[PDB]
Design a binder for this molecule. Sequence first.
Ligand SMILES: CCCCCCCCCCCCCCCCCC(=O)OC[C@H](COP(=O)(O)OCCN)OC(=O)CCCCCCCCCCCCCCCCC
Ligand SMILES: CCCCCCCCCCCCCCCCCC(=O)OC[C@H](COP(=O)(O)OCCN)OC(=O)CCCCCCCCCCCCCCCCC
Ligand SMILES: CCCCCCCCCCCCCCCCCC(=O)OC[C@H](COP(=O)(O)OCCN)OC(=O)CCCCCCCCCCCCCCCCC
Ligand SMILES: CCCCCCCCCCCCCCCCCC(=O)OC[C@H](COP(=O)(O)OCCN)OC(=O)CCCCCCCCCCCCCCCCC
Ligand SMILES: CCCCCCCCCCCCCCCCCC(=O)OC[C@H](COP(=O)(O)OCCN)OC(=O)CCCCCCCCCCCCCCCCC
Ligand SMILES: CCCCCCCCCCCCCCCCCCCC
Ligand SMILES: CCCCCCCCCCCCCCCCCCCC
Ligand code: SF4
Lengths: 198, 311, 100, 162, 60, 101
Amino acid sequence: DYTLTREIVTDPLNVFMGKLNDMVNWGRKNSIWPYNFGLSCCYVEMVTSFTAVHDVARFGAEVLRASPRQADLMVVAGTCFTKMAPVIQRLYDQMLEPKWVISMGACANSGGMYDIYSVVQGVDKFIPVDVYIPGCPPRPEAYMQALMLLQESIGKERRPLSWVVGDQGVYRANMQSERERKRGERIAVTNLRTPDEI
Amino acid sequence: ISPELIEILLTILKAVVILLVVVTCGAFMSFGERRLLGLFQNRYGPNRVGWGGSLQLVADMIKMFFKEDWIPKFSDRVIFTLAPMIAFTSLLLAFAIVPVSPGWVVADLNIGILFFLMMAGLAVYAVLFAGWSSNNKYSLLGAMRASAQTLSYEVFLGLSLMGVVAQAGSFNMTDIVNSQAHVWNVIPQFFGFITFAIAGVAVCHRHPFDYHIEYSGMKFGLFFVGEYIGIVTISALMVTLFFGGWQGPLLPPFIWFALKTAFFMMMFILIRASLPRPRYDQVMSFGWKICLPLTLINLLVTAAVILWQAQ
Amino acid sequence: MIPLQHGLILAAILFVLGLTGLVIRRNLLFMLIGLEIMINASALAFVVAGSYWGQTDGQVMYILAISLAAAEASIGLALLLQLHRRRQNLNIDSVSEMRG
Amino acid sequence: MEFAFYICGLIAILATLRVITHTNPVHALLYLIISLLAISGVFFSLGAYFAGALEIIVYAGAIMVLFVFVVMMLNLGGSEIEQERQWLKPQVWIGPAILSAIMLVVIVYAILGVNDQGIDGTPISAKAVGITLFGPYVLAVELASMLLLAGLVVAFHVGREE
Amino acid sequence: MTLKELLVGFGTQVRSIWMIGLHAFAKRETRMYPEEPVYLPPRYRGRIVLTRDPDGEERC
Amino acid sequence: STEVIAHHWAFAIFLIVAIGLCCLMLVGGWFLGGRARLSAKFYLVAMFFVIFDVEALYLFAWSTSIRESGWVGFVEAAIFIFVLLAGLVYLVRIGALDWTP
Ligand SMILES: CCCCCCCCCCCCCCCCCC(=O)OC[C@H](COP(=O)(O)OCCN)OC(=O)CCCCCCCCCCCCCCCCC
Ligand SMILES: CCCCCCCCCCCCCCCCCC(=O)OC[C@H](COP(=O)(O)OCCN)OC(=O)CCCCCCCCCCCCCCCCC
Ligand SMILES: CCCCCCCCCCCCCCCCCC(=O)OC[C@H](COP(=O)(O)OCCN)OC(=O)CCCCCCCCCCCCCCCCC
Ligand SMILES: CCCCCCCCCCCCCCCCCC(=O)OC[C@H](COP(=O)(O)OCCN)OC(=O)CCCCCCCCCCCCCCCCC
Ligand SMILES: CCCCCCCCCCCCCCCCCC(=O)OC[C@H](COP(=O)(O)OCCN)OC(=O)CCCCCCCCCCCCCCCCC
Ligand SMILES: CCCCCCCCCCCCCCCCCCCC
Ligand SMILES: CCCCCCCCCCCCCCCCCCCC
Ligand code: SF4
């Protein structure tokens, strides 16, 4: 159950090529360089994650490039305004493969609370998103959880090793949804602490 | 099999070992800069990829290697490929003269620190080529400003080192570290020491003296590894020129040299973490009005003391 | 065991190449480039002459030659910048008003 | 040191020939920097260690840094001259080619008739050059400082902005 | 610039370096997510659920 | 000799391995992975660098032979450095070295 991009296909994978692909995916998922992109309040929570009290640096994702060429992760953390949607599209085009997209917050997910004339209702209207984060704003640890989700998504995708040989198509794994995976524990919740307590 | 060929092979293997260690130390000191900034900023830094983050550098290396190699369409391919090549090899060859131990030196040249000055000029060329070939106005302007900075501090890099050269009476590195057999040159050439430290920070484009936006993939990695190799080279050079190099009372010579070099690498990281960045005009005014006359007066007083003490 | 004639021949080749580049190029920057080539070839010839006789005199006049080269390149590039400022082209055939 | 001398001389000749015929200013400056490194290698082959050190320090580290600075200041993208390529047409360059070839033939004929014991390549250190520089050549040093001061004043006066 | 200003600036740079070094000798303030779970207050506004009565029927 | 030629071979191998390492790094970066007018102040500061750099080379030549030149050479280099500093004071005092006016 994979997905081809240049189609629901199967697992394509010599046994040495599988180990080579696993090492490539391990190196790509353990070194993810986000693009410094200040849109709205969700970016404030993103840079709150980048600080000392949360330390996204532990995952190897602290480099925070100001140039789209060096970065390989686009965290759309803010509202997709109509004036900035071409800017976001151009910055995504300037990135180089492999690249991944995380929508952070309700604005980047669907437009959020701003169903208004000057706001594009979600960045997935024009940019293929890999991980969505609900929240307004999502807390910094929610951004780190989404980073880990992106890491385990990257760790089993199949990409070409070299551009001169082999299949050049990009295979993305169809992950099981987090909602269906966590339904076994979320439904079993019975009692929560009362709101009058600290 | 002859003893002369055995000695030739041993010296070649010694140079190969030195080269591999300085390149590996530059990459692992990029990683150590991340970890040390984490230490100085009340956090941990990368400590999840492997034990303590020791496999992080392999992860960025694999990410750099398996990225889309990209050259701009309206750019000069040769100069774009050439600029990281120069930024790597120039400061690597600058390290090629530093004696890390008695008997462990790549080339015992009679020019020495002059070869370091040649390599520094070629590093300035690397910055200029990177800025021009990107075909970008922002990168071109940033290269103009950065290259004028490096010129304003290479104007006195050598004149800061001339106090040590004057005391040693030679350009050779081993003669310089042998001239500090009793007192390290940081004591008499203190003003030369501070001016050389300032110039070494400035010509390495390090904080607080810091055109890379068009570079990506392995070229950006080559640029950064060359920058940290330049950090290693400047640290080892000031260890050999002002702190005796391999000489010390109790520890083996490599232990003393490595401890002093690692202390200056940590001082690089602490300078980056602590000081704010000054403005352009104040930086160049400090480079021209302050450091150059200080180096000239230091050389004059050094010569006067040397000739006075020659009975 | 390197002949002096070979070094002098190499220096003369570089000198005549610099003179050819100085003549055939109308761009003022390429003429300054040619001037740098010729004075560097003259300095190389003097270094060869001083190394054949085993004297420091060749390197001393090399030093004087490159002091002249540095200052001449400074003045020439200042004049080139002024020419590009007041007439926006480096073609020297435009700069031909005094004649006869 | 013989093979190094001949290979560096050949590289310098080829790079200079590429310089005088190239149309891109930055490529021409790069080839001339390669030629300057080659001539420094020629200097190191002949034992003139200080001359080669200053060839890379000053000639291939300062003067053409100034040239590259001026070229990128002007933003020379090959305008109004690269559209011409006049020096590549025979009618411009053959005449000076015969002129330079005749001069080279005359200078080579004069060179081949000199007493030649060969260059031993014994390394003349920078210490001896500094001893001679402040011994028999004192007034040369002082008036060279004055010459560089004059060049500084002239280039500042002409190359201002206002 | 003024020599007194230069000395005061040098002393202040040394002071800043000393403070950052003493920050290196201090306790880490990092909460190690995900190994260390996030403490959330009881009235924190996160995921929405529908609850039941004590009898076990849905309260909506 | 043996030690000198061994050090020369070591330096040559150092150069060759460094160049080959950088070339191999760039080749591996290229092969691997899928695909999809300035002001006159810059000239002024570079020219000042060039002039003070050749005056620096004069001081470089002096500094390695101070003891063999004696007090006479100190007097001559003192005159040289005095002219250097007079030129520097002239450059500073007229605003040539001020980046902003
Ligand atoms: C992209 C690549 C571009 C090309 C790069 C270079 C390619 C060739 C590399 C290998 C060349 C062979 C190795 C070098 C020769 C080593 C031996 C040597 O230099 O010996 C001469 C001298 C020895 O001195 P010593 O032995 O101490 O004195 C006692 C008496 N003999 O020692 C000396 O005189 C030492 C001084 C000369 C050392 C030169 C080192 C290289 C300089 C050029 C670097 C280019 C960097 C890239 C391009 C920059 C931008 C153009
Ligand atoms: C207002 C207008 C401008 C005014 C001027 C402003 C700029 C001032 C710049 C001053 C520069 C002073 C430099 C002094 C250097 C003199 C020391 C020296 O070079 O001594 C040489 C001698 C070793 O030589 P030798 O004995 O031949 O042994 C070599 C082995 N072959 O060495 C020895 O024997 C050891 C001597 C040790 C001496 C240590 C003390 C003096 C040097 C350190 C000063 C530290 C100052 C700290 C900060 C003070 C406040 C600013
Ligand atoms: C291989 C095919 C071509 C590949 C591309 C070109 C690469 C560069 C080739 C030329 C330069 C290196 C030549 C090889 C030198 C190897 C070492 C050697 O032969 O040393 C001899 C000598 C050592 O000095 P000495 O003490 O006199 O030795 C006598 C021994 N008792 O040495 C000396 O006296 C000085 C040695 C030369 C000076 C140092 C090296 C200078 C390098 C300049 C490079 C310029 C840029 C080249 C760009 C090429 C591409 C365009
Ligand atoms: C291995 C190599 C690396 C070694 C690492 C350790 C050494 C690192 C050296 C770093 C040097 C950084 C130098 C920065 C100089 C900045 C100069 C500057 O721009 O100063 C301007 C500032 C204000 O000037 P003002 O005229 O008042 O401006 C008014 C405008 N509204 O004026 C001022 O604030 C006055 C003071 C200016 C700076 C004086 C010198 C300070 C140098 C940095 C601190 C070094 C402390 C010791 C570090 C360890 C040494 C081993
Ligand atoms: C080219 C560079 C030329 C200049 C440098 C030459 C070399 C150094 C020569 C000695 C310099 C001494 C400078 C004066 C030190 C004492 C004055 C001082 O630090 O003033 C700055 C500041 C003033 O206090 P203020 O900001 O008004 O705060 C209110 C407090 N009641 O007060 C403070 O911030 C508090 C005190 C801080 C003291 C810091 C350390 C002073 C001594 C440093 C010695 C050298 C250290 C070398 C590096 C060590 C670490 C590696
Ligand atoms: C930043 C440090 C760079 C060092 C480069 C050189 C590495 C050479 C490795 C040699 C190891 C042995 C040295 C001689 C023996 C004395 C020390 C013994 C314990 C290591
Ligand atoms: C618009 C003005 C252009 C001027 C171009 C000048 C070109 C001069 C070329 C001279 C060629 C001489 C060729 C050799 C002549 C015979 C040998 C020398 C004289 C005996
Ligand atoms: S989702 Fe909420 S917090 Fe995030 S950008 Fe929109 S309004 Fe701001």
